[PDB]
Amino acid sequence: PTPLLDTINYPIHMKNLSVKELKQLSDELRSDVIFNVSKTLGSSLGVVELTVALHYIFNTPQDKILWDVGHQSYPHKILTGRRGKMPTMRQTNGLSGFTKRGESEHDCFGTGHSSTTISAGLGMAVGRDLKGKNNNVVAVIGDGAMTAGQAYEAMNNAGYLDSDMIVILNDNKQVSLPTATLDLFEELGLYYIGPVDGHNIDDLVAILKEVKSTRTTGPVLIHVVTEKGRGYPYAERADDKYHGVVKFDPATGRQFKTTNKTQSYTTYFAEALVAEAEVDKDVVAIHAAMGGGTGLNLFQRRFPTRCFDVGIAEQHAVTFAAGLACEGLKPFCAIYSSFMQRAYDQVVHDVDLQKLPVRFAMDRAGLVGADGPTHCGAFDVTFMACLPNMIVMAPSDEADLFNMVATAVAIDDRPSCFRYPRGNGIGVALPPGNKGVPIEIGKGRILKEGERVALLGYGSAVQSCLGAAVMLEERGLNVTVADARFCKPLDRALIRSLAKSHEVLITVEEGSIGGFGSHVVQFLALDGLLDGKLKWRPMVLPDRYIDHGAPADQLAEAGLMPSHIAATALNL
Amino acid sequence: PTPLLDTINYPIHMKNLSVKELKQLSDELRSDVIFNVSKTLGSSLGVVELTVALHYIFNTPQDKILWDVGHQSYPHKILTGRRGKMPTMRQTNGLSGFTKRGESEHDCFGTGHSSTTISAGLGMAVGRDLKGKNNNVVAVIGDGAMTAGQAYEAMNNAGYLDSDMIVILNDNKQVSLPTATLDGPSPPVGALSLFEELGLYYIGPVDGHNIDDLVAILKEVKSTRTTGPVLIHVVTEKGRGYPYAERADDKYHGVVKFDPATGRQFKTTNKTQSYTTYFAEALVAEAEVDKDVVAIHAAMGGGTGLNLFQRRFPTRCFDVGIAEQHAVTFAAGLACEGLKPFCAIYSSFMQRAYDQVVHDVDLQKLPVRFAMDRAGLVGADGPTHCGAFDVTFMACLPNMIVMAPSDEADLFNMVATAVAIDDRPSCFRYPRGNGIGVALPPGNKGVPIEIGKGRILKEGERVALLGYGSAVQSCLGAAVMLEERGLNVTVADARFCKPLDRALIRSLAKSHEVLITVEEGSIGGFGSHVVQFLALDGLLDGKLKWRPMVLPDRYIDHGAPADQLAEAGLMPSHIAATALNL
């Protein structure tokens, strides 16, 4: 089916094609990408031709092709000797769902988060020039990634430093976020070439040949125009869906309706928020690029006058919420915890200094699994929690999430963060939450009795704690499990009470071991409860970035999953 | 001549003094500056006319005049009732040297970081529109603020949403906006200031000092009759109407004490050997012998000290403009290509690049060094500029080594290790302030240090004061007496916050009745790490009596670092009070 690609293990092999074969090769690549994604598309498909043209033209890994986000670089990987590893792309122990510098020499940059390619490529371009080297730099940034500030300033500087580099604007007219499986410029003083057919491969080859070496005059933006999902009609027709398509039949487009087959924390936040804004005209939702993936599609439909896609500009989303909140709105930045890091300062400075009524509904909090280390949102519990007046929450379920939403909208005290994972609300065997009644902010909830050992933890981590303590449920609840559904402030009182009465605690968070665990320990230290009588066992994400997997795999290896909490509890 | 503007008390009063009265107001402002100097600049002067025009045209605080960074808004504050509080601006318990929403109704936003005004004013514009309100929104943003991504994306979105709102692109010379904690920012290439693709109304460039024209422009754009977002490129000499400031907007950015009559200033403050100078000196020294070394700064070249570095190693110096995100990911790209890029940047501004550190650098463990100036309390630039968070936010980032040199020697050693340690990133956090100038490499300030390994600086086994940088100086100063008291209370240069000296922590932890940690950071940083390490070293009963003596989890208003530190209870006196509490 793919005779060209069968003889392509690398960009050299592609160059052994003729330009004419590249159209054939791209169809093959798209059919490979289709198949790769068929298991459970649009960005990579939309990028095939330019990937092909770039690897036909450019001499990676000598030349540097940087893929903003790297989600569209499936053909790039395929064409860089990772074709047969596409099957395990993003899978645990497999390749990344992005270009990953550690994965491939052809991966110039370790992307996931967007808009970095320009800056990275600028870095490379300068860094080459500094070393007196002379290889190309190419970035491929999506139009979505171009909306980001770091893209734009990077271009400002790229076009200020005037180095060899070829930005490609891959305009399929899609804001496409960072994720690893499931997702002119006049004043920049940059050459601008396009828009062009981002699927006329031979033309992209021709352009790329003729632009990459203009470089003595400085950088070029090659605006190409793609079709997201290109060469998969269904993906072309429904790029938003198909971009992160589930298991689909390449024959029919028909896919597994995971979204509907579940109910996500996105959905819950979305439902809670679309519910909230009905009764609250100050409520305004803001997503950076993620009306879909923070679930706000219905919100955007229902409250279009209160919905703000900033594109992939989390900083924007947050400081725009700061501005909304400054005008006495109740702006809610829907965003992932991984992307909240982009807005970090905007939280700190733009919001929290003035203790603004910015709520943050924080998806993908902790380990996102598949989206790997670029997208593991394990750090918000740390970084948000060091910000004065950033209240931080983690709902155990949609009820708590709503309550949390409902408090933050109602509490103009200061901003509130609500962190909840990529996934769906599991609350069957494990105790979930209330029903939709605003709780006391900062006040945890014991969900299991016990005074020997207390498993302070929240959201995904409380599911783990409760899961760990399941047997303790059945055994007179020796091990308490507290919904430490407030990371900021902590339930200092509950902490104090458990920590003064328990031989030990376990803290658990789907976060790095600088977050909640460190807060609990901080608070205990402040309470002087960190005597040798007291112990505390932080069972969390380690201080190592977490390569793509299942969250369960990663959490298991991190040792916060029920088994590992239980192993801690056996160590206790 | 105070009188005229002295009898002026409200925006209405200012409006009452219009044509052939603006000049008198300017003279009064100059006189006020002189009076402020006698007992006890550059953008504020450069922005007088725009501020005047904006307050003349716009009915703040009903209308919203936002000031990107907020530093240039001295006339704004002056003209919004804080004229007699300019004397106490940036002073402890006084007003912010930036617009601060909690300071004034007229401060529509709380700035000090750059590039926020657009996003903020967009938020205000939307928020108005959503509330069915109809007040003007205007932001004044410098071009230097404009170079930032957050500016640019916000404008991208501003022009996407097409709400009524106004951006006054300030700074024709394109000179970096005057950051209260940064210094000679003039070699910055921040000149984004054009917006066709932003779909924003664009007007100007206009004389940003022709006030009556600014008023005229402002009337005809920032009426409620104007739909959608407008950029008013004004053209504003930084230092305008102060010749010396106009001549040296780099210096008069943030001029020291000076005589209005003569421009003569106390270069003295800057004549101190700063941590900027040490980093700069170390780095300019390092890059001589290291061609992988590339310094990067986000428009802070003066106050990261890199003016000499840019001079000596222009081929390795990268002002990215006010684009810390850019600096860090660009350093990630340099670092990817096997450089040893060093993002010189302030800890407050490093927060901008936070993700870029996390994602762009640390996930690939890139050789991005960070020379984090303004670490901890910067003092008088207050909560918008206190870099007390790096010790927290960086320290949760896998493989982000974090240091704090106790002096230039340690800073060099630190620099010299991170350059050598090109398998990972390293942050070096040192305050706004001064230390000791060491000899160049001829005197071998390239002392080798073991990264991650603290240094006991004072003996003691009763109490151990783990601290670094400003906080070690506090610990050692706390332990001044302890020293004269048979050295009961050790002080450890906890000069590594990541990794900690787990071994030393452990060894002090298990031997001392008590610890103190001390950091010129929030009580989420070093202290939280120590206690996290003690937690994990419950193997060795890290369950000592620990005292985190640090910046509270409260944003700190502009003051002296020492005032703020004292109030934060990390200063020597407070550590000693802690030591008595131990």
Numbering used by the authors:
A (entry chain A): 73 to 112, 116 to 258, 320 to 708
B (entry chain B): 73 to 112, 116 to 268, 320 to 708
What does the paper say about this structure?
Small heat shock proteins (sHsps) represent a class of highly conserved molecular chaperones that prevent irreversible unfolding or aggregation of proteins under stress conditions to maintain protein homeostasis. In this work, we study Hsp21, a chloroplast-localized sHsp in all photosynthesizing plants that plays a critical role in chloroplast development, fruit maturation, thermomemory regulation and protection of the photosynthetic complex during heat stress. DXPS catalyzes the first and rate-limiting step of the methylerythritol 4-phosphate (MEP) pathway responsible for the synthesis of metabolic precursors for isoprenoids in plants. Here we show the formation of a stable complex between Arabidopsis thaliana plastid sHsp, Hsp21, and its natural substrate 1-deoxy-D-xylulose 5-phosphate synthase (DXPS) under heat stress, and report cryo-electron microscopy structures of Hsp21, DXPS and Hsp21-DXPS complex at near-atomic resolution.
Three-dimensional (3D) classification of the cryo-EM particle images identified subsets of unbound and Hsp21-bound DXPS particles, and the structures of free DXPS and the Hsp21-DXPS complex were determined to a global resolution of 4.0 Å and 3.7 Å, respectively. DXPS is a homodimer composed of three domains, with domain I being the most dynamic, indicated by the discontinued peripheral densities and the lower local resolution of this region. Each monomer adopts a distinct conformation, differentiated by the structures of the active sites located at the interfaces between domains I and II of the same monomers. DXPS catalyzes the oxidative decarboxylation of pyruvate to form 1-deoxy-D-xylulose 5-phosphate that requires opening and closing of its active sites. The density corresponding to the segment spanning residues 247–274, constituting part of the active site, is fully visible only in one of the monomers. This segment, previously reported to be flexible, likely undergoes disorder-to-order transition and acts as a gate to regulate substrate access to the active site. Moreover, the closed and open conformations resemble those observed in the pre- and post-decarboxylation states of Deinococcus radiodurans DXPS, respectively. Immediately after the segment 247–274, the density corresponding to a large surface loop of 52 residues long (residues 275–326), referred to as the mobile loop hereafter, is also missing in our structure due to flexibility. The final interface is defined by the interaction between the hydrophobic groove of the ACD of Hsp21 and residues 318–322 within the mobile loops of the DXPS. This segment spanning residues 318–322 in the mobile loop are disordered in the native DXPS but becomes ordered upon Hsp21 binding.
